[PDB]
């Protein structure tokens, strides 16, 4: 793997808050979207050079936002670009057929109904439903085609700093600043699971030592972007605390579908707190297996994902216990968002110091992709 840190600021040295690749791409060159405090959403063209170093070409600028843009997400088809910011309005952009633009984008839908800054956005698999988290303690589910809100979750007690949508279309997961993870049933439109506390073994005096899983306000990152596995089997939630010794340690919790009230495991991240989780959309054939019960889940394939903390990125897969990659000390301030490319050859990382970076992989470096992507057991 190679690490290319960009020495030129994308948003006039203002913090970059979000990144996302165009998932609809099926070739070798990719489209990337970045949001910043400069009230601009910039779309760039990313491709590898002859040597293998990533090269970024500027494509377009979207300045309709009046305040800082915090989250940018592409639809599963890569056709609609969702941008949310401090103006509490979500803009849906599409390609249409203004001096600085190589290609032009225009707003199609203005999703309104939030009262404060929007921090995270997640699409549904079909692309006709969307979910957004905001500072106003509410997570709103929107009908994309109608461009109107369809449900509001106000059970949160603080800022909602992360929302993910189940690829099987059964649950919606929200992480809030109140150290509480919430899982809402997509059919009941109510709260299905609450995950706030956690016990750690047996106490010294035979007591039930129970603490809070997630971090307090001391986190330096606005976001707690958890994520579902592309197959949907596992749920990865950053910003977790484990009382290993007399002091707590930062970790990312890993939950199963079989039981969502207790995680299978936790990936520890000593040092700073984990804030983002993003999975590679490529299903890989299993590595030559040394037979052990080490795998997080036992399925014929494996999936690579990345966990971004304040100052590092850890690259894990499904079957190994230890991460196969670790990058750190490439940005002078807290990281904001990570995004994989469609082919898995790029991992874009954004940080609040104003500069972004890329992690590139050679052909079949992560693994051998499956011949056919496994079919999903959708709930609907």
């Amino acid at each position: 793997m190679k690490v290319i840190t960009c020495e030129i600021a994308w948003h006039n040295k203002e913090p970059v808050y979000s990144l996302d690749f165009q998932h609809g791409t099926a070739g070798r060159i990719h489209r990337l979207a970045s949001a910043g405090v400069d009230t601009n959403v910039r779309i760039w063209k990313v491709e590898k050079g002859p040597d293998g170093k990533a090269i970024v070409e500027f494509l377009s600028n979207l300045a309709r936002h009046t305040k800082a843009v915090n989250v940018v997400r592409f639809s599963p088809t890569g056709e609609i670009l969702a941008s949310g910011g401090d103006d509490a309005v979500i803009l849906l952009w599409k390609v249409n057929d203004a001096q600085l633009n190589k290609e032009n984008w225009t707003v199609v839908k203005t999703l309104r109904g939030h009262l404060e800054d929007v921090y995270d956005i997640c699409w549904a698999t079909d692309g006709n439903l969307m979910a957004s988290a905001s500072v106003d303690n509410t997570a709103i589910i929107w009908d994309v085609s109608k461009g109107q809100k369809i449900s509001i979750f106000n059970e949160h007690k603080s800022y909602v700093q992360g929302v993910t949508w189940d690829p099987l279309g059964q649950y919606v997961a929200t992480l809030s600043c109140d150290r509480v993870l919430r899982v809402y049933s997509i059919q009941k439109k109510r709260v299905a699971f609450n995950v706030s506390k956690m016990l750690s073994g047996i106490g010294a005096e035979g007591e039930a030592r129970s603490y809070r899983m997630f971090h307090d306000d001391s986190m330096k990152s606005f976001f707690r972007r958890l994520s579902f596995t592309p197959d949907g089997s596992l749920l990865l939630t950053p910003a977790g605390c484990v009382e290993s010794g007399e002091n707590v340690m930062n970790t990312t919790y890993v939950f199963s579908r079989k039981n969502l009230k207790r995680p299978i495991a936790h990936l520890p991240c000593p040092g700073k707190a984990t804030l983002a989780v993003r999975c590679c959309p490529v299903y890989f054939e299993l590595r030559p297996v040394v037979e052990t019960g080490v795998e997080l889940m036992s399925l014929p394939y494996r999936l690579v994902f990345a966990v971004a903390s304040e100052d590092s990125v850890l690259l894990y897969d499904t079957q190994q216990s230890f991460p196969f990659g670790y990058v750190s000390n490439i940005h002078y301030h807290t990281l904001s968002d990570i995004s994989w490319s469609s082919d898995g050859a790029f991992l874009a990382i954004s940080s609040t110091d104003g500069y972004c970076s890329f992690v590139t992989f050679e052909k079949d470096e992560l693994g051998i992709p499956l011949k056919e992507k496994p079919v999903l057991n959708m709930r609907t």
Binding site: P50, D51, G52, E362, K363
Partner: protein, 405 residues
Amino acid sequence: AFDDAVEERVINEEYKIWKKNTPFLYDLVMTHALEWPSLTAQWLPDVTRPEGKDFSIHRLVLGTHTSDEQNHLVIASVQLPNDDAQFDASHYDSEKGEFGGFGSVSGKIEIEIKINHEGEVNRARYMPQNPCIIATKTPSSDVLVFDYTKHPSKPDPSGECNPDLRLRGHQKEGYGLSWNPNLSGHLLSASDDHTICLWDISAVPKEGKVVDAKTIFTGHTAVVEDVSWHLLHESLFGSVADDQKLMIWDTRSNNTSKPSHSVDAHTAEVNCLSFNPYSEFILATGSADKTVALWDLRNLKLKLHSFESHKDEIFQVQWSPHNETILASSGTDRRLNVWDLSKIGEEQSPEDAEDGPPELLFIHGGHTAKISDFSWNPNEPWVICSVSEDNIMQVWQMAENIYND
């Protein structure tokens, strides 16, 4: 007589038509004419990837076959374009309708190290634990061991070589040579003296120069054509001889005259063998029957399969390091056959069966003479370097649409 002229004309026409059809069948073709014919060819594990460059540099160990000149052990460099550079929208030819143009981008093949060598280099194989150490088989009864870092980049002004180690176990020349991939310093050689010699050079002093044979196996009753260590076991090794026999020997066995297992592999001389890198039970042996026999170590009485598309004797069989179901075999028929194991026993259309058995995947007929030796590239998949008798070396790779599809 007329035989030589007719053969030359037919071979020239076949090479011309193969060159014309090469764009449809290959993604990389590099034909180079060496100074002298090479009897051996092996890819070195080194690949240097200079940062900021669109290519990688691989290395090859080759020999020279001079009738009356000074013979050389050669280490050469080959430049191969990087995968990321293989997609480039540099120019668009509006006439041919391709992103082509001959331009100035070309593969660079050059000789890096030349070392003196008394006699022809029958076969040169590097030690996996140390690529600096290379063992060569001479037309003499001794096996030579060189360290190319301890020799000048240019050959000596005159005289024969000064080998770092000389191993004297045989009485005649040979061609089979293999290092132990699990025990550093253990070398096996096979010769026409009907014996296989095992040396352990792991305890040689600094000033030592001659090593006697540690063990001699005399099971074979004919010329021992090839010997090869097992890739996962530090004790088992196979050998194929002119007596139509393949023998599996255990170094822990005290009987040096009877192998642990014996198999009547073929009906004529068996010239080569190679173990599959991904399966510890499967191996392949190429024979003079124009056949390649697949053998399972768990069932040696039954031949697993027989690849039967060659037109003459087979001298080298090597597995692909990047795919367990891919095999390769070369011989005197000027052809290099690549076979797929996963297509054995599959139904075939009447016209497809005209070309050959379903297990046959690819045919390389770019050589105008007997293919002396070929080797898979361990770093770049589907890249094979083959050297023939007419001092011709070809580093090639078949088209992606043939194996990927």
